[PDB]
Amino acid sequence: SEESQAFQRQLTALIGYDVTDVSNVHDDELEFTRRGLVTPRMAEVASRDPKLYAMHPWVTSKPLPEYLWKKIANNCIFIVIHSQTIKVSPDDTPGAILQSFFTEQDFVLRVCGRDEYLVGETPIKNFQWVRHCLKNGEEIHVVLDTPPDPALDEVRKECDRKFRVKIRGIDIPVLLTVFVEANIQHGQQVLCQRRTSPKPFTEEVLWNVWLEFSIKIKDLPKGALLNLQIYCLLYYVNLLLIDHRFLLRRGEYVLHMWQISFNADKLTSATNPDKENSMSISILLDNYCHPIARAEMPNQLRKQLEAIIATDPLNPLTAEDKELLWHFRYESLKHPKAYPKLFSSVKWGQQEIVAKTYQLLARREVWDQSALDVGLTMQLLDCNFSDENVRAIAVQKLESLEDDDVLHYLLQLVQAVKFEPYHDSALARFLLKRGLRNKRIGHFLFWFLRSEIAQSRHYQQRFAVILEAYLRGCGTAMLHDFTQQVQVIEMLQKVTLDIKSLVISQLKQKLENLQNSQLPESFRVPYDPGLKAGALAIEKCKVMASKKKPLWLEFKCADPTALSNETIGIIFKHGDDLRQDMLILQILRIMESIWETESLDLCLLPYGCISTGDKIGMIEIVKDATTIAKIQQSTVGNTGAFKDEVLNHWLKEKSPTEEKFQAAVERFVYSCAGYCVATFVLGIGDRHNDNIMITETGNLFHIDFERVPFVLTPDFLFVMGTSGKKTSPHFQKFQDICVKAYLALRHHTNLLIILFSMMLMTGMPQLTSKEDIEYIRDALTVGKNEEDAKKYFLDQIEVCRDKGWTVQFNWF
Numbered sequence: 009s010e011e012s013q014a015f016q017r018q019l020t021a022l023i024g025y026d027v028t029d030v031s032n033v034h035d036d037e038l039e040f041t042r043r044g045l046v047t048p049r050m051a052e053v054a055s056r057d058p059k060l061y062a063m064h065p066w067v068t069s070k071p072l073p074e075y076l077w078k079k080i081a082n083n084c085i086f087i088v089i090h091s092q093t094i095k096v097s098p099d100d101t102p103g104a105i106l107q108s109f110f111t112e113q114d115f116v117l118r119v120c121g122r123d124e125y126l127v128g129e130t131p132i133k134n135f136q137w138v139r140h141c142l143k144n145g146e147e148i149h150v151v152l153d154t155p156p157d158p159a160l161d162e163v164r165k166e167c168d169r170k171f172r173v174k175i176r177g178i179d180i181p182v183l184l185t186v187f188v189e190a191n192i193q194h195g196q197q198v199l200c201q202r203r204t205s206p207k208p209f210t211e212e213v214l215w216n217v218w219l220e221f222s223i224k225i226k227d228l229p230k231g232a233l234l235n236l237q238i239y240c241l242l243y244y245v246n247l248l249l250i251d252h253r254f255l256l257r258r259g260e261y262v263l264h265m266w267q268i269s270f271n272a273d274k275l276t277s278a279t280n281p282d283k284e285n286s287m288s289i290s291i292l293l294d295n296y297c298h299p300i301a302r303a304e305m306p307n308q309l310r311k312q313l314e315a316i317i318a319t320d321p322l323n324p325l326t327a328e329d330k331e332l333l334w335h336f337r338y339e340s341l342k343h344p345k346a347y348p349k350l351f352s353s354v355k356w357g358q359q360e361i362v363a364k365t366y367q368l369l370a371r372r373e374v375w376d377q378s379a380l381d382v383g384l385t386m387q388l389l390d391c392n393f394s395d396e397n398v399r400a401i402a403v404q405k406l407e408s409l410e411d412d413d414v415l416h417y418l419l420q421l422v423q424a425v426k427f428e429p430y431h432d433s434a435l436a437r438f439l440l441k442r443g444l445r446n447k448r449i450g451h452f453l454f455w456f457l458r459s460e461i462a463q464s465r466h467y468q469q470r471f472a473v474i475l476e477a478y479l480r481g482c483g484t485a486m487l488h489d490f491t492q493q494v495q496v497i498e499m500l501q502k503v504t505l506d507i508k509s510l511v512i513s514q515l516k517q518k519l520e521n522l523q524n525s526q527l528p529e530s531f532r533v534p535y536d537p538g539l540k541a542g543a544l545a546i547e548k549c550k551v552m553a554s555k556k557k558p559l560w561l562e563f564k565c566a567d568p569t570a571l572s573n574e575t576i577g578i579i580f581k582h583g584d585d586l587r588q589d590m591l592i593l594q595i596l597r598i599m600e601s602i603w604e605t606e607s608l609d610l611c612l613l614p615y616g617c618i619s620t621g622d623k624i625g626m627i628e629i630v631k632d633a634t635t636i637a638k639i640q641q642s643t644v645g646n647t648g649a650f651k652d653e654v655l656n657h658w659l660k661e662k663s664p665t666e667e668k669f670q671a672a673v674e675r676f677v678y679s680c681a682g683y684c685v686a687t688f689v690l691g692i693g694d695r696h697n698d699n700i701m702i703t704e705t706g707n708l709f710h711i712d713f714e715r716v717p718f719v720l721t722p723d724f725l726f727v728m729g730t731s732g733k734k735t736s737p738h739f740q741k742f743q744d745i746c747v748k749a750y751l752a753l754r755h756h757t758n759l760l761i762i763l764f765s766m767m768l769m770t771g772m773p774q775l776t777s778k779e780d781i782e783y784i785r786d787a788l789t790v791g792k793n794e795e796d797a798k799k800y801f802l803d804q805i806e807v808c809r810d811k812g813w814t815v816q817f818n819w820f
């Protein structure tokens with residue numbers, strides 16, 4: 009169409025990148041992938057009931073946790089249907105709740121303020137909103153609303169020769185000894201390895217040398233990088249030996265490399281988009297090779313095996329371990345927790361060994377019959393595995409996750425796509441399907457993919473191709489929403505940057521001029537999709553106090569049925585890599601969920617945090633909170649240290665009645681406990697102060713994501729009810745929690761270890777493929793007993809009490 013490229017313009021703008029360019033590719037994997045993604049899309053758009061879709065019910069299946077049952081150990085729940093109030097049972101479908109208020113079905117129980125319909129054949133107690141209400145001890149509130157017109161959700165239609173490589177040379181516009189080290193990799197595991205003679209290092213360098221590897225053209229497994237690096241390690245680049253059609257790479261190539269400043273960036277098929285000042289490498293791949301496509305173990309070794317298949321995912325495998333693990337393939341193949349180690353003990357450098365492997369996978373029943381382990385399913389999707397079949401079973405076990413869990417793991421999964429050898433993968437296609445199936449999962453997919461496309465040259469093209477596929481299947485409604493969301497931010501970030509260049513005088517001046525006619529009618533809060541936003545309470549927008557000059561904006565709720573005058577806060581900031589916070593906040597919701605399995609609870613406060621571009625993004629404003637210092641600053645501050653009894657007064661003072669003060673201290677121990685266990689494990693316990701806040705309601709929470717395990721300042725202890733070497737009745741509950749929460753995590757050592765490791769490889773700069781990760785093994789005290797550890801954390805608890813303020817004063 010001569011108007012079709014206008015839609016594409018719509019996409020391009022939503023995406024933030026152009027999946028139509030081609031000045032930075034050397035094949036058609038991206039295109040072929042766009043072409044290939046159409047089937048997965050249709051297969052989903054089509055297989056999706058327009059009814060429940062357009063309404064996106066949000067339910068769970070996990071058993072209702074104790075703490076929330078206790079708050080209703082009387083089997084009774086009232087649902088105020090807009091003001092005739094009803095009382096339902098923890099087992100009544102939205103219909104039963106419709107039976108009452110009514111005694112034609114063109115009505116649906118929507119929620120006041122948000123976009124959260126309590127529709128669908130689901131048990132009342134199985135609605136996230138309902139449980140949220142139970143959590144916040146609030147009261148449910150619906151509204152006789154007419155079910156949404158899905159029409160708006162219509163998707164606009166449409167040889168045995170040894171491998172050799174020729175290294176011509178490297179060119180750079182503007183820059184000693186330097187060599188090129190080609191490496192035939194697979195699973196981030198080097199195989200062969202050939203180099204070059206250390207010639208001079210200048211703007212141009214010709215070697216014209218063929219590099220004859222040992223691996224035979226056959227031995228080459230699909231998904232084996234041709235890693236080219238330059239040493240004097242300054243620049244690197246990769247090439248997929250076998251391309252997306254199983255064919256083998258053959259030809260002349262001129263690759264533009266990435267410069268170094270371990271991590272997931274070093275894995276990419278993408279070349280540098282900046283051919284203006286980036287290093288170049290010339291290589292030649294000329295050829296005419298063409299593509300392709302019992303008994304009983306003893307009794308002492310089996311023990312050796314079970315021992316191995318029982319250690320953490322970190323524990324390295326000795327050459328001995330491996331040879332053993334593979335010789336007993338069919339036994340190791342019985343224990344699922346053995347897959348990772350087992351498939352990491354395969355020699356992909358041998359068509360024959362690999363051959364067996366594949367024929368070994370067809371014999372997997374115990375696996376596809378065993379209980380789904382996310383921590384184990386995740387280990388199979390990391391950097392250590394580059395084989396389609398290996399990774400596919402893992403993706404097959406994920407296909408079982410209900411939405412609630414596909415959201416609890418979305419970010420980490422979307423980040424895992426950086427470990428996929430090719431753009432079209434079961435994982436991407438999996439993300440794609442669940443995106444289109446549920447609008448909630450789709451909304452976050454959108455922003456998770458966008459954050460990367462906006463700052464990852466390394467992974468933007470591939471991500472830009474997975475989003476496009478999504479933006480063309482979600483419906484016309486959403487596409488409008490995303491357009492409105494993207495506008496607001498692109499604008500608001502401009503304001504943010506300006507006000508940083510230097511205030512409150514030109515602040516509202518610029519703000520006010522913004523609402524004028526730019527700021528849309530009502531936009532969706534990117535971190536909480538079920539909340540619209542209108543004009544800004546300009547008279548409330550400011551600029552926080554700090555070297556960083558974040559923007560404290562507050563909007564009004566564009567909703568009438570909303571039973572409150574409450575505002576929608578939003579903190580925009582430039583200067584921090586909010587992509588490390590998102591990941592850390594994600595891990596937090598995971599522990600905030602693990603604990604639930606054991607009905608435990610720590611009242612964590614993971615606020616919304618959505619990256620948006622380079623060193624910038626949005627943050628959620630947590631109502632009625634204050635930074636730990638601002639409290640100990642009104643009284644002291646400046647050059648003065650702190651006050652022991654300041655914080656405790658801040659609670660009783662900042663809380664009416666006595667029925668509110670103790671609560672404010674009750675929910676203060678759990679929260680204190682929660683962030684101590686959490687940060688301790690996450691290895692980020694040594695935090696200053698302005699980086700730690702608490703609510704007038706008692707909930708404390710960290711922010712901005714000679715030593716100590718964590719911050720439990722005497723104040724916290726004070727509030728608990730202890731001056732020092734003692735033990736208040738609450739300090740006990742504190743411990744009665746911590747250990748019960750800390751040991752509840754050890755129950756997932758493997759999971760926390762696989763996420764931690766993945767977080768570092770795709771969230772931080774360069775990553776210590778060794779240490780930095782082993783830190784979590786230590787913290788969780790892997791291997792020891794349900795006691796040595798319990799004491800371990802306690803000794804930690806001590807050091808924090810033993811040091812009073814040793815660092816709080818230092819932090820300079």
Ligand SMILES: O=C1NC(=O)/C(=C/c2ccc3c(c2)OC(F)(F)O3)S1
Nearest residue numbers: 558615627628629630633711712713
């Ligand atoms: O400059 C900053 N960099 C960050 O990462 C910040 C985090 C933060 C998150 C939630 C909050 C908050 C602050 O104060 C609040 F009460 F608004 O609730 S502030």
